[PDB]
Nucleic acid binder design. Sequence first.
DNA 1: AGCGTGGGCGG
DNA 2: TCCGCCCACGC
Length: 85
Amino acid sequence: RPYACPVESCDRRFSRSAELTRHIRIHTGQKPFQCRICMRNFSRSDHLTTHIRTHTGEKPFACDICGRKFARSDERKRHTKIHLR
DNA sequence: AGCGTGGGCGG
DNA sequence: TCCGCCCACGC
Ligand SMILES: [Zn+2]
Ligand SMILES: [Zn+2]
Ligand SMILES: [Zn+2]
């Protein structure tokens, strides 16, 4: 944790600089990635990608048990667990 | 469910 | 640094 957050009202520390730079955007309100379709801005590129799937209906992740598809891998992970009970 | 969004991290 | 995952938590 050699990269602490300078903003006085915040107590965060990071292992890498790349993360402090990304984290700083929370305080600056910096939203660099815009959606062509709805023009909404996002703080992260990876979140813009998944958001875009809400428009196209793209669902790359299918459940191994029932085949139900989802836009994100975490949605599928949360789902598969329901086949236990 | 649907999906916003930050942290850790490998490349 | 960026990229783009996993992972996690929120409403
Ligand atoms: Zn901060
Ligand atoms: Zn959009
Ligand atoms: Zn299933």
